[PDB]
Structure 1
Amino acid sequence: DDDIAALVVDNGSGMCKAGFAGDDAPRAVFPSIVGRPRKDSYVGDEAQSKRGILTLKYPIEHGIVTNWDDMEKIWHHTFYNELRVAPEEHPVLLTEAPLNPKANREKMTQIMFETFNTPAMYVAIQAVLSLYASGRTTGIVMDSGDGVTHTVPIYEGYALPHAILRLDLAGRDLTDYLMKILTERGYSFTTTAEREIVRDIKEKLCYVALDFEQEMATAASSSSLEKSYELPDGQVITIGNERFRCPEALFQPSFLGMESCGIHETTFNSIMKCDVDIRKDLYANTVLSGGTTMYPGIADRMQKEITALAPSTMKIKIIAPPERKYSVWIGGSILASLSTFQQMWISKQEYDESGPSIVHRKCF
C-alpha cells in the first residue's frame, strides 16, 4: 500500500493463490490440498506424492467450508510457508463465496483475528472483485469456478441478496459428467490419476460447444469435429462425437442428469429479480467471469446468451478478456493496493467496539 502494506490471498477450489498487493501475477500458486496422517498438513508437492499415508481433503467444497480446521490449516500453511512474512506489518484480504451466511462470516473474521492475530483485515466476495478488474462498478457476473458458481448481480457497490443466484453447475460437476460419459461409453476408472488425466483432456483438447443441434447436425452428416489424441501410455482413444457433447450439459440441464436450472434461465431469473431501473444500466456493460475458460470458446457463448437475454436497443457492449480465469485475483490485487480503499477496510478498533459481526454489515 502506502501506509501499511496490504496482502491478497485468493483460496480457490483447484489451487491456492497468494501474493502481495500491487502484483499483477500471484506471488505463489500451489494446488489445493491439506494433509493429515492416515507428512502432516502440507500444501504442495509432498502431500500430492505421499497420498498413500496422507488423507486427501479440500478446504473449500462448494463455496462452503466443509471442515473449519481444514480451512485454518491451509490458511496457516499458506501464510507461513508460501509467503513467509510477519503478519504484524501486513493486513490480509480474505475471500468468500457470494450469499454466504452471516454466522459463517462472523466465525471467519473471529478465527482470523484471534487464533491468527491480524492487525486489520477484510473479507470479500469474489465476483464483485472480479468486476472491479474490468473497470466498471456495476454489472451482472456469471461466475463458474472449479466448484464454486454463482450468477451475482451487483450495481454501484451493492448486490441484491435476493437475486444472487447460487448455481449447482461447476468444475466438480464437470469432472463428474466427464467420468460418467466415459464409463457410459465404456472406459475404466480406478484411481485419482485417471480422473486427473480426463480433466486435463477436457481442458486442453475438448471443443466447447455453442448449440447441441448445430454441431451435432454437422457431425452427423460427416464427422469433421474429430481431434486425434495418440497417448504414450499405450492407449488409443479418439472420438469427436463425445467431446462436443461433453460440455453441453449447461445448455440443457438434463444432459448431466441434474435437477438444477440451466445457465440461460439462471441469468434470466437473476436479471428479472434484480431491479427494473438498473436493468439497462446493468446491460450498458456486462462482464465475463469463470475459471471454466481454460478452453476459450465459452466466452462466445457468454456474449451470445447475454445478447439474447437483454433487449437490444444498442450493440452489446460486453467486456470479454482473457483475464477471466484470474479475474478474482487481480481484482483483490488492484483494490487492496490503493490508499483510499483503506477506508473500506475493517480495523481492530471496529472489531473491538462493535464485535466481529459488523463484517456482515460493512461488506457484502
Structure 2
Amino acid sequence: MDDDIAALVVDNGSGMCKAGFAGDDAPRAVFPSIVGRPRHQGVMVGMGQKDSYVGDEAQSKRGILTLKYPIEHGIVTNWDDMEKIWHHTFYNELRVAPEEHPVLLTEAPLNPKANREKMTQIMFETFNTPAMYVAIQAVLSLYASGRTTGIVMDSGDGVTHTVPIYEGYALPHAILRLDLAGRDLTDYLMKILTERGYSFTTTAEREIVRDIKEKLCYVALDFEQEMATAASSSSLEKSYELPDGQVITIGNERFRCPEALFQPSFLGMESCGIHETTFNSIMKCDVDIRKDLYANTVLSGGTTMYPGIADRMQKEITALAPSTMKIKIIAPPERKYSVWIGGSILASLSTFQQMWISKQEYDESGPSIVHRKCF
C-alpha cells in the first residue's frame, strides 16, 4: 500500500470547521470553530488543564473554559487563536505533521487580501507545510457540483455568501455577501421557543434551542401557505419533550423560522430574502452567463440542510427569473458537508498538484503570495 502522503483538506465553514485527508469522501475532523480557554486559571492548572481548548475539546471543557471564536461572522478575528485551533486540530485530532503533508486551505468569499496573507504566513511559518493552497469554500463546493460556471450559495452558521463562477473563474463583480446565516436563525428560533413557553436562556439552553431548530424547523415551499396551515392545522405544530420531560410545542416556527430565508424580516433581519439576493446576484452577473448561473445554483453549507429549502428556492427563482431563464437549484444531500467534499474533490485533481503554493514559493514571496501566487 503506497502511503501517498495525503494533502490536507481543511473546510472552514461559517459554523463548523471540517478537516481531513485528500481522497477521503468527507473531512475526518469536523468541530465548531470555537477555542475555549479555562475560565479559572487557578484551580484546574494543577490538573493538567490546557490554557485553552479548541473545537470539540473546547466544548468538552466548556464548563471550566471561556470559549472564544477566532472566526467571527465568518471572518477570522483572532489569527493567533485560529492558528492555535488549526495546530490543535492537526496534532490532536488529525495527528499529522503538517511539514509532511500539503495543506489545502479554504477561505470565505471576499476574505481580505491581508487576511489571506496572514493566514499564509501562519501556515508556512507555524506549520512548515511543504506546499499549500487557499481556495474559496464556495468554489470547492462548486467543483463538488461538477460545474465550472454557476453561482454557489454557501450558507454556514455565521455568514452567507453568493459566489457567481464562470468557466471555473468566480465572478467577483457578481459576488454578494449576506451577514445572515445559521446563528441568526438559531437566535430567532430561540426567541420563538421562548414565546412558545420553552425557556432557553443559557448558552447551553441556547445550544439546545439550536438543536431543536436543526431537528424540527423546515423551509416552507410557500411560507405564507405553511403559516396558514400551521394556524389552521396542528399538523405543522410539533411538541418537543425536554430532557427533563417537559413538553414544549412548536408550530409555525417549524416553517416560520426558515421562512426568514424568503422574509428575513420574519427573523427581524433587514437582509433581503433568498429570492431577492438571488435576483440581485443574477443581475450582477453577465446576461450571457445569467442563464447558466440560474441553471447551476449549488446549495452548500450546514444552513442549506433545512427541509423544503429546495422547493421554496425553485418557486422563488422561477417567480423572479425571466421565464426564458433556465433555473436549476442543486441541493446536494450532503450540502451540510459540501465544502469538505468539494475540498477533497478539488485537492484530488492531478492537474491541481501544480497549483499548490510550495513552502519555497512562500519563502520567496512571503505572505503577499496569497495575493500574488494564488489566483
Instruction: Flag whether TM exceeds 0.5 (same fold).
Output: yes
1:58 lines up with 2:69 in the alignment:
yes
1:44 lines up with 2:55 in the alignment:
yes
Structure-2 change in CA distance of 1:47 and 1:287 (3 Å): closer
What percentage of aligned pairs have identical amino acids? 100
Structure-2 change in CA distance of 1:184 and 1:274 (3 Å): same
The CA distance in 1 between the partners of 2:63 and 2:294, in whole Å, is: 51
Q: 219-228 or 129-138: which moved more?
A: 219-228
**Deviations for 1:143-185, whole angstroms, at most 9, x for unmatched residues?**
2111121011111122222221110210110111122223344
Structure-2 change in CA distance of 1:203 and 1:89 (3 Å): same
Maintained 8 Å contact 1:131/1:137? yes
SS of the residue 1:153 aligns to:
strand
Which structure 2 residue ranges, 5 or more long, are not aligned? 40-49
Maintained 8 Å contact 2:313/2:329? no
Offset of residue 113 of structure 1 = 0.9
Maintained 8 Å contact 2:197/2:248? no
The CA distance in 2 between the partners of 1:101 and 1:232, in whole Å, is: 43
Structure-2 change in CA distance of 1:135 and 1:216 (3 Å): same
Offset of residue 316 of structure 1 = 4.2
Offset of residue 13 of structure 1 = 3.8
Offset of residue 188 of structure 1 = 2.8
Maintained 8 Å contact 1:79/1:85? yes
Maintained 8 Å contact 2:226/2:252? no
Q: 111-120 or 308-317: which moved more?
A: 308-317
Maintained 8 Å contact 1:153/1:163? yes
The CA distance in 2 between the partners of 1:316 and 1:353, in whole Å, is: 45
**Deviations for 1:297-352, whole angstroms, at most 9, x for unmatched residues?**
21222233333333233764443321211111111111212221012211233333
The CA distance in 2 between the partners of 1:140 and 1:124, in whole Å, is: 16
Maintained 8 Å contact 2:106/2:135? yes
Which structure 1 residue ranges, 5 or more long, are not aligned? none
Structure-2 change in CA distance of 1:162 and 1:87 (3 Å): same
The CA distance in 2 between the partners of 1:244 and 1:295, in whole Å, is: 10
**Deviations for 1:244-276, whole angstroms, at most 9, x for unmatched residues?**
222221222222222222221111111111112
Q: Report the RMSD for the aligned CA atoms in angstroms.
A: 2.3
**Deviations for 1:208-238, whole angstroms, at most 9, x for unmatched residues?**
2222321223333443322233344131211
The CA distance in 1 between the partners of 2:209 and 2:276, in whole Å, is: 29
Structure-2 change in CA distance of 1:314 and 1:49 (3 Å): closer
The CA distance in 1 between the partners of 2:232 and 2:99, in whole Å, is: 66
Maintained 8 Å contact 1:169/1:250? no
Maintained 8 Å contact 2:138/2:339? yes
TM-score (norm 2): 0.89
**More strand by proportion, 1 or 2?**
2
Maintained 8 Å contact 1:7/1:21? yes
- Tell me the residue number matched to 1:33: 34
SS of the residue 1:288 aligns to:
strand
- Tell me the residue number matched to 1:298: 309
The CA distance in 2 between the partners of 1:83 and 1:174, in whole Å, is: 31
Structure-2 change in CA distance of 1:219 and 1:318 (3 Å): closer
The CA distance in 2 between the partners of 1:44 and 1:276, in whole Å, is: 43
Offset of residue 12 of structure 1 = 2.7
Maintained 8 Å contact 1:142/1:267? no
**Deviations for 1:69-110, whole angstroms, at most 9, x for unmatched residues?**
210111110111111122232110111110111111111111
Q: 96-105 or 215-224: which moved more?
A: 215-224
Maintained 8 Å contact 1:251/1:263? yes
Structure-2 change in CA distance of 1:319 and 1:245 (3 Å): closer
Maintained 8 Å contact 2:189/2:253? no
Structure-2 change in CA distance of 1:19 and 1:226 (3 Å): same
Maintained 8 Å contact 1:2/1:338? no
The CA distance in 1 between the partners of 2:5 and 2:201, in whole Å, is: 51
SS of the residue 2:241 aligns to:
coil
The CA distance in 2 between the partners of 1:324 and 1:83, in whole Å, is: 23
Aligned length: 364
Offset of residue 135 of structure 1 = 0.7
- Tell me the residue number matched to 2:21: 20
